[model samples]
Target: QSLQDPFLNALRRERVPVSIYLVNGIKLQGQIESFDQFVILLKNTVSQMVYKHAISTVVPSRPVSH
Candidate 1:
């Protein structure tokens, strides 16, 4: 259910939080108010390269300028 080995290896340098939800492929429930913070964390997760699988959707929270 994961990407190929090479792709997964590339992600080794990334800081993607191995969330229990993600490991279990379960729905996430929460709110993230800081897009910038999230972006940094996400970028760190990708080791500065945007991961192909990383996508963004409007999170349920009060919008704040990035």
Candidate 2:
């Protein structure tokens, strides 16, 4: 297993809400609909494409008990 595997696996397994912070001081909140090494597809009402490198951090908006 790779380090990236765990990260990707969580997204694939659970539809958790997350807040993505960009390097330019922009923030986006949505579910991790899809992702790759290059970009992430986030959707709330509308889907947004975010470059992986441009992301500063991903914060969970709510606690996941499971």
Candidate 3:
């Protein structure tokens, strides 16, 4: 079985901005454009792909620091 359902559900259920943290220490913030069992597509200034296994966590985007 795949755990993609709950993750996708959480993303779709909220319809809010989020930051996706990757295991490599990269973070992408935007609304989720599309997602599947293997990848999550994020839409910001440009389209981005974040592999499911590469995801460390997903959280609300924090305020920018100056």
Candidate 4:
């Protein structure tokens, strides 16, 4: 029961080293630990919760395949 849950799971399940872009023209390097209603969690280099509030883009480092 989630919107964009499929894509969320793809990024998280794959853990394929994604990139995060913020609204203020800053590119952030991170990945997903989990995505909740409030924020997305990171568990790669460190643990942090980021809101998708002002994010510009979310890029999965690898191509999606069947």
Candidate 5:
């Protein structure tokens, strides 16, 4: 899932660009090289998504070069 309403609302209030990504819980998975910008984006997305789901474990994430 992408950024949720709460996170999006926060981002909108803060006037910051919202970056998001989705990860499969059952999948084990990034890249050797990564751009800091993208990494931060993914992190924000994952954090927002995690916050939406309570009592659930988050899947690991890796940064991949794009």
Candidate 6:
């Protein structure tokens, strides 16, 4: 079940800087590379494999305008 389809698709299309908070009290900032059925891949400073089960929450923000 792709519950984050709607939520993640926005980050996919917008290609904005994304912030992911882990269940272990850790957070990371990156860009979404791909969203899978069970894993959503992110890339930037470092490539992070988001194990859906360990993620507390995901956040997004707008990109620069030209």
Q: Give all candidate RMSDs, comma-separated.
A: 13.0, 2.5, 6.2, 2.2, 13.0, 4.0
Worst 10 residues of 4 by lDDT: 57-66
- Which lDDT tens digits does candidate 3 get at residues 14-44? 6557888899988889987788878888878
Give one clash count per candidate, in the order shown: 1, 0, 0, 0, 1, 0
Query: Using Cα atoms with residue i matched to residue i, what is each candidate's TM-score against the true structure?
Result: 0.22, 0.79, 0.71, 0.80, 0.23, 0.78
Give candidate 6's whole-model lDDT. 0.78
CA lDDT for candidate 2:
0.80
- Name the runs in model 6 displaced over 4 angstroms: 1-3, 63-66
lDDT of 6 by residue, 1-66 (tens): 445786787787778887889899898788888877778788987776788788888878665332
Candidate ranking under TM-score, highest first, comes to: 4, 2, 6, 3, 5, 1
Indicate the residue-level lDDT of 16 in model 6. Answer: 83
Query: Which residue pairs overlap in candidate 5's backbone?
Result: 31-63
- Lowest summed lDDT across 10 adjacent residues in model 3 is found at 57-66
lDDT of 4 at 7: 80
lDDT of 4 by residue, 1-66 (tens): 564677877888887677777789776667787987657786666877778896778778888542
Put down candidate 1 lDDT per residue, 1-66, tens digits, no spaces.
343333333333332232212333443333221223224223222333222244332232232222
Q: Candidates' lDDT values, in order?
A: 0.30, 0.80, 0.75, 0.75, 0.29, 0.78
**Could you tell me the TM-score of candidate 4?**
0.80
TM-score of 6: 0.78
Among all candidates shown, the one with the greatest lDDT = 2
Candidate 5, residues 1-66, lDDT tens digits: the string is 344334333443444432233344432111111112123222332432222232122222332122
Off by over 4 Å in 3: 1-4, 61-66
Winner on lDDT between 2 and 3 is 2
* Two-way TM-score contest, 3 vs 5, winner: 3
The 10-residue segment with the lowest total lDDT in model 1: 32-41
